[model samples]
Target: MKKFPEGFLWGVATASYQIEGSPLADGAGMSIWHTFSHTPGNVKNGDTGDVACDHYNRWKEDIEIIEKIGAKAYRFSISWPRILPEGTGKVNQKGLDFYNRIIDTLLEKNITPFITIYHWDLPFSLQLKGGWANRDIADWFAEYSRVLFENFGDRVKHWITLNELWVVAIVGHLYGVHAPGMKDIYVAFHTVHNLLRAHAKSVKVFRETVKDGKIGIVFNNGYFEPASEREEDIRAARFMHQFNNYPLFLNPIYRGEYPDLVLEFAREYLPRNYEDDMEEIKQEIDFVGLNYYSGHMVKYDPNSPARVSFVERNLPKTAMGWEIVPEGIYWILKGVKEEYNPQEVYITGNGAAFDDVVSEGGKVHDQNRIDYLRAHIEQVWRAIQDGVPLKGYFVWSLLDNFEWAEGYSKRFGIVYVDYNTQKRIIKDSGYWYSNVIKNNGLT
Candidate 1:
C-alpha cells in the first residue's frame, strides 16, 4: 500500500482547446488551430475542434463529474485566442464569463482550480504576425495575463503561465505537426526564446498583480534512452537531453540565461539581444508542473541528418504511438528533482491515449489505461517517500475529447464520451481513481 502526505493534492487535467468547443462564440476570435486543422491534410481525417467535447456548454455537468470522481484539484487551461480574441487587447466579456462560471462551479464543488493561461491556442491573427518569434510577445502575453488576473484571479489559487511550451515551439512551429505548422529549426529556436521571455514576464505580472494566487510553468518532458553504448550514441543521448529538456527556456528560468549545450549545438538563433530579455525570462516561479508521459529511445546514426535519430523502442505503445516506458516516469521525476529543486513540484499531466470503446451496458473497461495509471501513480508515491517534494499529481485528462492533431480518434480520458450522442460514461478507471483520491492512496 502507498500513502500520500496530508494536504497532497490529487487532480485531473484538461486543455481548453482540446475540450472546449465554440472557437468563435461570443466575441472569441479564431485560433491558429482553427485555421491549421481546417486546412486540407493538416489534420487526420480533417477533424477539427469545431465540436470537441462540447465542454463550453456542459461545464456545469463536467464539474459535477469532477466532484463525483473525488478530485481535489482540477487543472484546466484557457484558450488564449478565446480569451483575448487576437491574443492581445480588447476584453472579451463572453470569454471571461465562460471561465468565471467554470471556475466558480469548481470551487463550489470544493475542488481547487488550477488554470493554465496558454495551451498552444495562439490566435491565427497573431500567427499572421511574427507569432512567438516576435520579441514583443512577452509584453503581449503579460497584458493578456493581466486580463485573466483581473477577471478569474479570485478563487483560482493555482495558475500555470504556459503549458508544454516545447511542444508549442518544436512540434507546433518547427516540425509542422501542430497548428501554424512550419518545419524550420531556426524558427523554433527563436520561438522557444520568445516563449520563455513571455513566460517569465507572465510570472512577474502575476506576482505583482495577482496577490492571492501562485504562478508557475508546465514543461512536458520525455525520458530519452540511448540505443547503444557507443561514443556517438552517448553523444546522441546528450543531444536528446538538450533538444528535449535543456534549452534557452529551462536554463534561463532556473539558472538565468541559456544553457551551454543549447548554445553549443543550437546557437544559430540564440537571440542577438537576448541579454536584455534574459531577466524577464529568468524570473523565478512559485512551482513547476511536469507533464511526463514516457521516454524516447535514441540511436546513433552517422548517415542521419542530425548525427543521431530516434530509434523505435520495442515496447508497448498507446493509441497515440507513444511508448509505454513507465520506468521513465520514475527517472524523469528523480532527474528533475535532482537538478532544479523547485519549491513546489507536481505531476501536472500523465496518461496514455488508448483505443477505448464503449462495452456492453455503456461501460468502458480500458484496463490497459487503468494498469498504466496504477503503476505510474505508485511511482509518484515512491518518489515522495524518497524525499522529493512532489506535492500533487494530476492525470492527463478527465474526458475523451479532441487529441490535438490526432483529433478525437484517441481517447485518454477516464470518462468515455460518445461523440455522436454527446453521452458521457464513466470508465472503470474513473471509479478506481476516485477511490485513490478519496482514500488518499490505493490500499
Candidate 2:
C-alpha cells in the first residue's frame, strides 16, 4: 500500500467509436470502421458500432459511473469523422459541441479528461484517399490536431497523439483483422512510416500551440521471451523484440532512425526518403503511454515471413486468448525506463476479457478480471518502486462496448453493459476496483 506515490492518477479509458453510438449523428461523417464493420463477414456476428453502448446520448450517465468508481481521470478519444466530416476540410460544430459537453461533465465531476486525438477511426473520405498510406495524411493530421488543441487544450491537460500504433499498421494493414483491412506487407510497412510521420507532426503542433498541456503517443507494447534456452530460440526472441515489440516504433522516436533489421529486410517496401522524416520523428515528448496487454514466447522459424513465430505457453489465458503474464508489465516498464529514459510513463490501457454471465442473484462476479487487474497493478507498483517514473494507470475501458472485429462478444469492462437493453450494471470487479482507487493501493 505504501509503494504507490502520492497524486498517482487512477482512471479508465474508452475510444469514441467503441462506446459512442450514433456514428453519423449531429452532421458527423462516416468513419472507415463504420464502412468496415458494415461489410458482411468483416466482423464477428456482423456487428457494427451503429448502436454501441449509446454513449453519445448517455455520456452523462457514463460519467456518473466513473465518478461512482472514485476514478481520478477519464481517457477518451475523439472521433476524427465527428469533428471533420471529410477528414480534412470543414469543421463540424455539432461534433465539437458534443465533446465539449463530455469534457465539461468530466470537469464537473472533478475527473481529469485525457484526450486521444486518433484511435483508429479515420474518416471514410480519408481512406478513399489512401488513409494512413498517404503522405498527405501528415499534413491532414497536423491540421486536425491543431483544431483539437485550439478548442480543448485550455481545459484538457493530458493529450495522447495516437493510440496503439502497431495495431494501426500491423492489424489493420498487414493482417487484415481491423478496419481498412488489407493484407499487403508493402502497404503495412508504408502505413507504419506514414503513421509515425503523422505522430511527429501532431507532436510538433502540440508543442507550439498546447503550451499548458503534456502530449505523448500510446504504444501497444508487449514483452518477448525465448520459447526455450536454445540459442535459436533466443535469437528468435531478439528478432521478435526488434520487429513486434517496441523497437519498430520507439526507435524512430528515441533514436531518430529505424532499426537496421527492418531496413535490411524491408528495403524494397520502405517509403521514399523516409530518412528525411526522422528529424520530426525524434522530437522530445513529455511522456510515453504504454498500452500493454500480453507478452509472447518467440520461437525460431526460418521459413516464416519474419523468421520468428509466437509459441503458445501453458499459461492462463483471457477470452481473447491473450497470455496472462503479469510480470511482463514489469519487464516492459523497466525496459522503457532504461532504454528511453522517458520523463514519465502511464499504463494507458491494460485489461482483459472474460466470458461473463449474470448470476441468479443478478450480479456479474467476474472474479477473473479482478485477479487480472490486481496482479497487473502489483507489477506496476513494483516497477514504480524500482524507479520507472510511472505517473498513472488507466484500465482499458469503462464499459463493454464494441470490441472492434470481435464486436460485443468480448467483455473487458469493470461495468457490465447489456447490449440489448443498454442497461449498465457494476460488476464485482468494479466494486473491488473502486476500493483500490480510493485507497490508492491494495491492502
Candidate 3:
C-alpha cells in the first residue's frame, strides 16, 4: 500500500450510553434509552446499558486503551441527562467533571478529542414534554449545547452537533423500535422538522460561542444502487436515495428547501408551517461527518411502502444484516462530493459487526473485521485521491459494548470485552489497525 497524504488523522469512536454504563451514576438524569431498555419487549434479550462496558467508571483505562492502540484521536458523545438532569434548568457538576476528566486526559495523552453533542440520548425529562416533536426542544437543545461550548470548547476543537438524524426520525419514531418509540409517520415528519430546527439553533450557538473550533453534523447513510438497467429501476434508486438521505436531512441542511419531487412525495405528512423554518435550518458550518456502513440495491415495486423495495443480493452481510459492499464507499463519497460539495468531510464512524469471538488460545482473532476496515479505508484513500477532501477516519468502536436495539448482540469493536467480567482484550484487528495508523496507510 502507498503512503497516505501527510496530516491524515486516525482514531476510534464510541457513543455514550452505548459504552458508558451507570446510567444513574453521580446524580445523572434518565435518558429515553434507559427507559426503553427497561420496558418489557423493547430491547432484545432484555439487555440494557445498566452495566455496559462499565466505561462510566473505567474511562481512564479506556483512554489508556486508545493510547495503546496508537490512534491519534478519539471520538465520543456526551449524554444530555448527565449534563442537565432536568434537560433545562440546573446543571450537574459531576456530569461536567466526568467529561472534563476525559477531555483533559485526551489532551494530556496527545490524542485529539472529537466530541459529539447529541448521539440520540435525549433526557427522559425532555421526552415527557413531547421531546423532538415539541418545537421548544430547539431552544432546549440550543441551551444544552451552549453549556458544552462554555465548558469544553477550548480542548475539543472537532464538534459534531448530532449523529444520524434520519435514523432518529425513522428507528425511533417511524418504526417504534428505539427509545421514546412511536410508530406514526406524521410524528416522524414533526420529529424531522424539529430536529433540523434544533440543529440550526445549536449551530447558531456554536458560531457565537466556540473559538477556533469547527462544528458540523453527522449523517449515517449509504449509496442506493438500482437493481436493473431499466429506467424504472434507476428512478426507484433515486427515490430511495431521496428518502434515505436528502428529503429527510441533506436537502433541508444544505439547500434551505426540500426538493420539489421529495416534497410532492411527502405532500401531506409534513408538519404544518415547516416551510417557515427552512431558512433557519440552513445555517452554514465548516464541515460534515459521514458514517458509512453499507449500501442497498433497490427496485421499484408497486405493492411495497412508497412503491419501492430492496432487491437482495447474494453478497455477504454483517452481523447487523448490512451488505458488505466496499465499493459502495467509493460511490457514496464521490456522490456526496459531487452533490453537496462541503468544505471538509470525515468518516466519523466506520466498522463492521461480526460474530467472531475470543479463541481457545486465549486471544481474539478477527480477520473478517480487518478485511472490512482495510477495504473501507482503501475506498477512503480513493476518495481523497480524487479530491473529496476527506480528512479523518474513526472506527465505530474501541470496545465491545451495548448495541442500540440489538443490545450486546453485535460486536463492532476492535477490542473485545467480556461482558460478565468487564475485561478488555485487544483483538488481531486492533493490532492491524495500529499498524495502519503507524504507517499512515493500509500497509
Candidate 4:
C-alpha cells in the first residue's frame, strides 16, 4: 500500500452552530441559522439547535474524544454572531472565552487546530443589515479576520476564511433553504461576488496578521458527468461546474478571472456594482480546501422544472440520499490542480451522513459509514500518489449534532450522539481512522 506524505494531517471537521449548544449566550448575537432553524416548519420535525451536542459547554470532553481517536488535527468554525454580537463592533468576552477554552484544550491534547472564520452562521443582525449583499461586508470580513488572527492565530496554524461560499450564496440566497433565506437570483449573484470579495480581502488580512500561519478557503464542489452522449448534455455538465464551483471564489484566486460560462450566466442577473466588486475579489490564496461527497450525471433541460437538471444514476447512496461516488474525490482534486495550480490543498470535509442506530450492546455500529470513509480515504491516497499536493484530510464531523434543515435526521459523525443521554459512542470508523492516522495509511 502507498504511504501518505510525512506531516499530512488527519482530523475531523465541525461547525459551531451545528455542534455548539447555546445560540445566544455570553453576549453572543443571534445568527440567521439560529433564527431559521427555530422558525416553524423550517427544520425537520421542527427540530432546532437550541440545544445541540452542547459542545459549547462540553468542548473539553470532545477534546478527549479527539485525542482518543488519535487525530493530529481538528477543523472547526467560529460563529460570527458569537464573536461580534451585532456582526461588527464591540467584542463579546463570553463568546471569546469559549474559544479560548477550546483552543487551550486542543493544545493540551497536542492536536493542531484548524480554524474557519465563517461557516453558514451569519449574524442575523448582519442579515437584517443586508448581510453579505452590503458593500461593507468585505471590510467586515477583513476586520474579522484581523481580530481572529490577533486572538487565536497565535496557536492555530491552519486558518480558513470561509466554508462553502457557493452554498451560502446560491442555496441560501437563491434557493432560500439556509440562513437569511431569500430567492432573488440577482441578489444571490451579488452575494456570490461579495463572498469572493470577503475571501480575497480576508486572505490579504491573514497574510498581514498571521505571518507564521497558512490560510485557505473551503468549497463543496461536486463532480459533474454527462448523462448521455449528446453535445447539450456534456455542455450542461460543464455549466454545472462553472456555476457551482468556479467564478465566485476559486476562479479569480487560482486562474485570475471568472470562468467564461459562469460569467455569462451571472450576466442574466447583473448587478450595477459588479465591476468594482470583482477588483476586490481576485486576490490569490495560499491553499484551497476541497469538500467532496458525490458526483452527478446531468443533461440539458430547457422544459424541465429545474433548468439544466441532473438525472440520478442507479448507484449505492448514503443515508443523506447522496450517491456514493468515491472516485469523485480523485476527479475533483485532479481538476482543481490542473485549473488553479495551487501549492497546497486539503480534504477539509469528507463524510457520508447515514441513519445510524445504537445496537443492543449500546454501541453505534455504523459499518456502512465506515466503508464509505475507507473508500474515500483510499481515493485521497490515490490523489496524493497522482501528485495533487494533498496536505490533509478531515471527516465532515466529530459528533452527530444538528444537521441544518435536515436536523438530527442525518447522522454524519464517526462518533454517534445519543441525544437522549448526551452520550458519544465512537463507531468502528473512528477506530479505523485512528489507526490510519497513527500509521499514516493502511497496511
The per-candidate count of clashes, in order, stands at: 0, 0, 0, 0
Clashes of 2: 0
Candidate 1 least-lDDT 10 residues? 241-250
Q: Candidate 3, 212: how far from true, in Å?
A: 1.3
Kindly report which residue stretches of model 3 are placed more than 4 angstroms away from their true locations once superposed: none
In candidate 4, the residue pairs with backbone N, CA or C atoms under 3 Å apart (3 or more residues apart, or in different chains) clash, namely: none
Q: Which digits, one per residue and each the tens of the lDDT, describe model 1 over residues 1-443?
A: 68899999999999988888888998899998889889999887889999899999988888899998999999998988778887777888888888888888887789999999998888877888888878788889889998888788867878998888888898987789997888888888888888888887888788877777899888888888888887778778777776676333577777776766557767676677767776666677788888888878888787875677898877888887888888777777777778777778889999988888888887888899999999899888888887788989999899988888888888989998988877899889999999998789977
The lDDT leader among the candidates is 2
Worst 10 residues of 3 by lDDT: 241-250
- Model 3, 185-283: lDDT tens digits are 888878888888998999999988886889998888777999999998888888877777634577777877776656777768788778898888999
What is the C-alpha lDDT profile of model 4 across 1-443, one tens digit per residue?
Answer: 65899999998999998998888888889989888987897789998878899888888889999999999999999998888888889978887788988999889888999999999888888888799888788898888778888899888978898999899988898889887878998888778878888888898888788888988889988888988889988888888887776334677665556677777666766567566666666666678899999988889899863358879889999877788989989988888888777899999999989888888987777889888988999988998889899988999889988888899989999999988888889988788888888789876
Q: On a 0 to 1 TM-score scale, where does candidate 1 land against the true structure?
A: 0.97
lDDT against the true structure, per candidate, is 0.84, 0.90, 0.89, 0.85
lDDT of 3: 0.89
Candidate 1 backbone collisions, by pair:
none
| Candidate numbers, best lDDT first, in rank order | 2, 3, 4, 1
Q: Tens digit of lDDT per residue, candidate 2, span 1-443? A: 64578999999999999999999998999999999999999999999999999999899999999999999989999999999999988999999999999999899889999999999899999999999999999999999999999999989989998898888998999999998989998899899999899988998899889887899888887789998999989877777667666678888889987776777677688787888888878878888999888888889888998788888889999999999999999998998888878999999999999998988977999999999999999999999989999999999878998999999999999999998789999999989989998789888
* TM-scores of the candidates in the order shown: 0.97, 0.98, 0.98, 0.97
lDDT of 2 at 59: 92
